[PDB]
């Protein structure tokens, strides 16, 4: 599928990168970048990196917190859009 959503203006956008996004009313209302969740992620924001990093305990904890209020998925921020991966 790879659904795509506009990232909202108060979501924490910081350019392109792998991120978690909380989706509400067809918009990514909050993004949290992998490079911020996991300071030791020094990769290049390649889509396939989520297979390794999706199971990191810090990613799991961040996603659980977002799921408290909205549908949450891993994906890619790019050009003000969130693409589910």
């Amino acid at each position: 599928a790879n659904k795509t959503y506009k990232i909202g203006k108060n979501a924490g956008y910081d350019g392109c990168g792998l991120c978690l996004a909380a989706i509400s009313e067809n918009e990514a209302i909050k993004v949290k970048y992998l490079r911020d969740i996991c300071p030791d992620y020094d990769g290049d924001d390649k889509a396939e990196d989520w297979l390794r990093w999706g199971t990191d305990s810090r990613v799991k904890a961040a996603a659980l917190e977002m799921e408290q209020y909205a549908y949450t998925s891993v994906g890619m921020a790019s050009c003000w859009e969130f693409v589910e991966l």
Binding site: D14, C16, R35, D42, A47, M76, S78, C79, W80, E81
Partner: protein
């Protein structure tokens, strides 16, 4: 034996170079810079110190300032799946928000050979990007 090894090795053999320049230009930086800081400087240098979309001057002293400049994709990932370094540019946050989910060709009205498109193409062509990257950014 397996382009990945060359990528990982040559990509190794490009980060010390960019880390060395970061120390040169920010010799009073506090702590260790991260990869995003290092890459911002690399793109700054290849773009001749200017925002790619607007041509405006990037204040090198503000390079690491929150909200000032961002690295983003030129061609939207949603439409290309292109997460490569050849698809990454350094842009003022405000100009990147105006472009949104458009390609440069769309954003600059390249279909009408507009002056803004010609100006943008000239900035890309005069950058220090490799030919593969100039080609990527200008894809129609």
């Amino acid at each position: 034996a397996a382009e990945i090894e060359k990528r990982q090795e040559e990509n190794r053999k490009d980060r010390e170079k960019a880390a060395a320049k970061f120390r040169e230009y920010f010799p009073n930086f506090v702590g260790e810079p991260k990869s995003k800081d290092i890459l911002k400087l690399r793109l700054y240098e290849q773009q001749h110190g200017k925002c790619l979309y607007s041509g405006k001057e990037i204040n090198l002293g503000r390079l690491n300032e929150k909200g000032y400049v961002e690295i983003d994709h030129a061609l939207p990932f949603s439409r290309t799946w292109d997460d490569s370094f050849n698809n990454k540019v350094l842009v003022l946050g405000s100009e990147n928000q105006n472009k949104g989910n458009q390609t440069p060709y769309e954003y600059f009205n390249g279909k009408d050979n507009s002056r803004e498109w010609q100006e943008f193409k000239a900035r890309v062509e005069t950058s220090r990007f490799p030919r593969s990257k100039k080609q990527r950014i200008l894809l129609q």
